[PDB]
Ligand SMILES: *C/C=C(C)/C=C/C=C(C)/C=C/C1=C(C)CCCC1(C)C
Ligand SMILES: CCCCCCCC/C=C\CCCCCCCC(=O)O
Ligand SMILES: [Cl-]
């Protein structure tokens with residue numbers, strides 16, 4: 450049901466995708482260790498924001514690892530090209546994983562925005578409902594990326610509606626609570642918003658690849674887009690969230706944070 454199943458791959462195409470996914474694994478687990486060791490310099494009220502990055506690193510790292518092994522399982526070098534064998538490859542499992550990772554990305558944002566209690570619970574709930582609506586309708590959509598392009602587009606339109614509404618909630622909370630933020634992170638959080646708009650928008654572009662480049666090179670392009678998007682939306686994003694957590698910790702008087710920033 451996925452366009453990946455339609456083609457044979459050159460050694461070059463096959464190895465590049467393998468390397469992309471493998472590099473993706475290494476980057477996420479490398480970052481995991483960074484987030485782990487810096488977590489001790491985060492004040493208690495923000496420390497969960499950094500823990501969520503650890504959770505995202507392993508979750509994303511495991512899905513990339515799984516995709517890579519699925520890739521090598523599904524294809525074998527036969528008569529001059531990599532051809533589909535008995536096992537299958539699908540991006541569908543990425544969509545399932547987003548059900549967990551996207552709420553984590555959103556939650557760590559709300560935390561450094563200094564949301565608390567009732568407003569935190571209600572905002573998170575609406576955000577998670579919006580994200581799940583987006584992910585589920587998108588998941589259904591890509592089931593048709595070979596059989597019914599028109600259906601892919603319509604489900605994608607519905608998914609985009611959830612996407613836009615989700616982004617509106619995010620933008621609204623960011624620009625409203627920007628003023629509450631310490632240590633100059635009121636400026637930093639603005640760049641985080643634009644990072645999200647950029648990085649998250651790569652995913653619907655990848656989703657549409659079967660519509661504008663239905664060939665083996667389009668398969669490579671999609672994996673390339675996912676890699677750029679994953680690293681940007683999880684790793685670079687996580688680094689900015691953690692930086693914001695540490696800076697606000699130090700400004701709030703948390704001594705290990707102040708000491709940490711003093712060494713650099
Ligand atoms: C770490 C993974 C992240 C942040 C994934 C985000 C995914 C999206 C923003 C996907 C959105 C989609 C649309 C807006 C339309 C097509 C269907 C989706 C699910 C690919
Ligand atoms: C934050 C951005 C992270 C970027 C991660 C991607 C790094 C490697 C990117 C690809 C370089 C281009 C490789 C050339 C493709 C060769 C085509 C092919 O053989 O299939
Ligand atoms: Cl605290």
Ligand SMILES: [Cl-]
Nearest residue numbers: 509546547550
């Ligand atoms: Cl993920």
